[PDB]
RNA sequence: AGCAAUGAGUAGGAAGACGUGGGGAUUGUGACGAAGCGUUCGGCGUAAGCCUGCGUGGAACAGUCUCUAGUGCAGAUCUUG
RNA sequence: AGGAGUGUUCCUGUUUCCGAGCUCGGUUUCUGUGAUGCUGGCUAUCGGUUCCAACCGACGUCUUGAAACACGGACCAAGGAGUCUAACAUAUGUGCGAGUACGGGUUUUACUCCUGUAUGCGCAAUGAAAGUGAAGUAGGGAGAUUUUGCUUUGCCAUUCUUCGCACCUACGACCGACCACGAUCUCUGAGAGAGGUUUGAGUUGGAGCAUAUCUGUUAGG
RNA sequence: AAAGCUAAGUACUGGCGCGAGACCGAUAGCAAACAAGUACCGUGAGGGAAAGAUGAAAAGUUCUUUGGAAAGAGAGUUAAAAGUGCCUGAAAUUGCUGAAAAGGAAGCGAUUGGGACCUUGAUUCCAAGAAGUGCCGCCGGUUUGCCAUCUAUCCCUUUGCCUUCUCUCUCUCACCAGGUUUAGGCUUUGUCUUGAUGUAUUUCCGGUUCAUCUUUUUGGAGAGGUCAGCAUCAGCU
């Protein structure tokens, strides 16, 4: 008998455990976990989350864009809870020391031949326990086709929402809406 | 190789398995208990070790065991080992020394079962 | 074991309306109707089964003799209740021949296990 | 079974025409060996008890 | 996997997850998309702008290859044909020359930036960036039909 | 494992279990008696349910992990008997 | 409060009284954290399954409202109601990643295995169309680094200047459309340069494709 | 163009003849597992059911006895009457017997009680005796190999290559060669095993008998269980 919101008992919205049935996986978190619990550094305790996270936040960061947030570091380690992909655009690739959960097979070919050294994260403990001098990052999460339909809903008055539209061009949905010839623009 | 490896294969399923309720146990030799965890478990650890009544009408007792290091660990005749023992409480100090040259934290429940295992024949 | 037993109820909970007709068997089902007295929870009449009346966690599954018990089918299966006799009591099965019994009743004594069932066919 | 599946450790796998055999999340298999090495052990606290 | 629908365990209350007032009527609203004119309106503005009307001048018997031309863009081209490049860094005489065509694409676009090594571009159309780009890179542009 | 706070609920949502007919794998029971059925011999589980003595019965059935569905009834002026 | 043990060495309590300036230190016996102590009845009671008594309680659905003088329901058994296909969508698991997934060849013959050439969707958008077709900055921020406060080799600081991922907020540049210019050329055109309370489902060193399941929308009995 | 022929690949709930099944199992599956498009209804167009199971073998109950007969009762066949709509044989419903209860309903919840009925010198420990059991030891045969050594390839480190593959806008280019990916036979170079030494160990019979522990029967020392009484404390009151 007490006035409380919920009587709560009030839950924490993030995930609070693994997913997958995937056994390398779940070893991993066991080292992290063990590793974030008993060493205090916080980038430990970062990493644990972000190995639990769904496959649209472990997304893919290029070669390319992984040049340039580790530009001014060379020395570090680049840590990455997510793949790496090859950028074809990318002519010479920079070499580095890239941890990542997966390395595409060209991706691979064009760090090791550059003289470049591709790390898994159970070698990154053994090297960098405490996560002393590393660089944590990831790649842009609001970037996909799901997530430009997002927000205000595409006949709003200053929304830059894609419609679900069966296909392009002109004949679907360029009309009573779009032009102010045919009823308003909104 | 790795026992956590095999253990996130095989926990969930396995030809010993024998469940009743919530009471779950493990047929297999190299196991004291009977208990299905990665610990005590034949199947899946590195050196693992059984205390059985030996298998002639169950007169005497065996130490059954691996060759440390997992050495002939591809080679399933070589790989175990077996010694026999007298049931008595004298030569549970042979026992108990030999258990503790594979397995130091396996000590006290191996003296648990071979006080049992003496009170044992068909 | 054997620790204290303590039950909270001693009744089953049996079905709205068993008593009354035929048709609605004993075994238990939560009223849905939406005017329904027992659902509403008047002064009275059935109970129903909350999470509240769940026993003991140390004395959940356990005989009035002090064991678990843990059901047991051939010669073979009993041998796993060797380390745990003291804490498990064994059921022969529903189906076991009087050959077979026989010969799990007397395996069972040589290893010092109680068996539930005795004087189970003669 | 080598002309086949290949060689485990960049370049492909002969029959199977741009098959790789696949590479685990880890290198090294097991928790216990890593965990207990002493480059972990040392810098972890003495633990704790409740 | 009907186990693991809602029905199976939904089953055992009477309305079946439709509700008691409501109730799971056969077609409330009309069939399709049917109402969108009326009744259905709001969902329609917002959602699905300019839905209603016609706007461009129809081309009777349009043909696609007519009109089909695919873009590579001057940021990709090496991509295109990695031996050459080390031979095309060397030297400072001849080029190593990209038929765009051969991989399959008929127009460039200057979206990236390239390389300072002089080569030859051959594609059906040129953007006007384009040009610009690879002309400072010291490469040389060239049609083909 | 420990500590603290909390516990009403139709429509509705989510989570973990119980049960049924088949498929794959595995561990078994059975003409010295399988399935089913009956029962104040009884027991376990908050509960769905599970285990089991005795009687009848006379030929096939079950446990475990998975896959699959024509998978759970008190009602429909429900249907057939 | 209860399977044993040893026993106070430390610890708090109460107490013997010795010294230092009511307070602290040293010392002796006693009791706790380390306490269950003594004793009896029955070996049938205790307990359990059934039926019965007694005191108190206790009159499916639509609806604001049902024990209703609202409707359905005599009894029992068996049968009986969100399924399958397609088109999308979010979410999540698995594979590969700027890519990704009708035939033929094998074969013990509906499985399996391998494979050439295309195509799909994606990798670029924008105009009705002719067509044309892409330079970052600031603020807050995960984390690392350098340093200042507290039980100590570990604890939390915002103490520092160093780099600041994702993402949100503010503003740019570039591409297409519309509007309005234009030095100078090989002048039906090209184009230095410079715009605009306009506009796009644009852009800014690419994330998608295939597959599995749930939930939703729609078509079909 | 206003005249014409033409196989193949393609379609196939019918006919004819094969092979399968994560299908149904007699209220299902076709309407039809049987004399089923049958019995039967309709003037007619049309409508359209129900109905599978004794036993391995009829060995399908002769014979005496009561009765008009149907049947009953003895006896008999069978593993059993399973006794002819005969496998198992649920519920609703019905009769008897036993057991209770009932002053114008009964059932039901919670709590006791009453009547029927069911259910219980532990665990051990020390001597002696028999019945088990038959370890090591000691031989013959057989198989593992602690530890100290010596050493292989795994792996990368390239080297000297050579061979066969594979990819490639690498070269005069039509062919050879050169890089890329595989395999192999070779190479320089720094914790999953061979060959010798024999801590130890299994299996195998004859043993050579002995340990061991098991159950049991005879003493000796030792009592758990359950329900209570009083006492001392710790918490709340």
Redesign the interface.
């Known amino acids: 008998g007490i006035d409380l919101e919920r009587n709560g008992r009030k839950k924490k919205g993030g995930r609070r455990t693994v997913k997958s049935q995937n056994p390398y996986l779940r070893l991993l978190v066991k080292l992290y976990q063990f590793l974030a619990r008993r060493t205090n550094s916080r980038f430990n305790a970062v990493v644990l989350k972000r190995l639990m996270n769904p496959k649209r936040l472990k997304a893919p960061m290029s070669l390319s864009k992984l040049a340039r947030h580790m530009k001014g570091k060379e020395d570090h380690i680049a840590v990455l809870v997510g793949s790496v992909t090859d950028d074809i655009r990318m002519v010479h690739a920079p070499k580095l020391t890239v941890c990542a959960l997966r390395f595409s097979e060209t991706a691979r070919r064009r760090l090791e031949k550059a003289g470049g050294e591709c790390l898994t994260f159970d070698q990154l403990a053994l090297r960098r326990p405490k996560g002393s001098k590393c660089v944590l990052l990831r790649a842009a999460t609001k970037s996909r086709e799901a997530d430009k339909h997002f927000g205000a809903a595409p006949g709003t008055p200053g929304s830059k929402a894609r419609p679900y539209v069966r296909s392009t061009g002109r004949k679907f949905e360029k009309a009573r809406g779009r032009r102010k010839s045919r009823g308003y623009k909104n | 190789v790795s026992s956590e490896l095999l253990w996130q294969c095989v926990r969930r399923n396995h030809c010993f398995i024998r469940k009743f309720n919530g009471i779950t146990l493990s047929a297999e030799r190299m196991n004291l208990t009977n208990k299905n965890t990665l610990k005590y478990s034949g199947i899946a650890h590195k050196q693992p070790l059984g205390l059985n009544r030996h298998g002639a009408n169950n007169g005497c007792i065996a130490l059954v065991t691996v060759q440390k290091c997992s050495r002939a660990m591809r080679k399933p005749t070589r790989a175990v080992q077996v010694r026999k023992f007298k049931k008595s409480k004298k030569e549970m100090s042979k026992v108990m020394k030999a258990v503790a040259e594979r397995r130091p934290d396996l000590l006290k429940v191996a003296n648990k079962k071979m006080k049992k295992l003496i009170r044992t024949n068909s | 074991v054997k620790r204290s037993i303590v039950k909270k109820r001693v009744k089953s909970f049996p079905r709205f309306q068993s008593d009354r007709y035929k048709r609605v068997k004993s075994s238990w089902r939560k009223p849905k109707g939406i005017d329904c007295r027992v659902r509403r929870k008047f002064k009275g009449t059935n109970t129903m089964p909350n999470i509240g009346y769940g026993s003991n966690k140390k004395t959940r599954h356990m005989l009035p003799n002090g064991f678990f018990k843990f059901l047991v089918s051939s010669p073979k299966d009993i041998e796993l209740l060797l380390m745990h006799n003291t804490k498990f009591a064994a059921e022969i099965a529903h189906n076991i021949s009087s050959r077979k019994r026989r010969e799990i009743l007397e395996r069972a004594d040589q290893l010092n296990v109680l068996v539930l069932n005795r004087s189970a066919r003669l | 079974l080598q002309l086949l599946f290949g060689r485990h450790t ?1 370049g492909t796998a002969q029959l199977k025409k741009g098959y ?1 055999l696949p ?10 060996r ?2 207990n ?1 002493e ?2 052990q040392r ?3 003495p ?1 704790r008890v409740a | 996997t009907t186990r693991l629908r809602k029905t199976r365990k939904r089953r055992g209350h009477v309305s079946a997850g439709y509700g008691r007032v409501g109730k799971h009527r056969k077609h409330p609203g009309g069939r399709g998309k049917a109402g969108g004119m009326h009744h259905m309106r709001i969902n329609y503005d917002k959602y699905h702008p300019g839905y209603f009307g016609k706007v461009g001048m129809r081309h009777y018997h349009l043909l696609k290859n007519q009109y089909t031309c695919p873009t590579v863009n001057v940021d990709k081209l090496w991509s295109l044909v990695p031996a050459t490049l080390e031979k095309a860094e060397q030297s400072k005489d001849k080029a190593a020359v990209i038929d765009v065509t051969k991989s399959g694409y008929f127009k460039v676009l200057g979206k990236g930036d390239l390389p300072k090594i002089p080569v030859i571009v051959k594609a059906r159309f040129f953007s006007k960036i384009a040009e610009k780009k690879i002309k400072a890179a010291g490469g040389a542009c060239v049609l083909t039909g």
């Not at chain 4, 590479?23 to 216990?32: K, P, V």
């Open positions: 960049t790789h590479r685990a999340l880890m290198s090294n298999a097991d928790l216990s890593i965990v090495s480059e972990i810098v972890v606290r633990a």
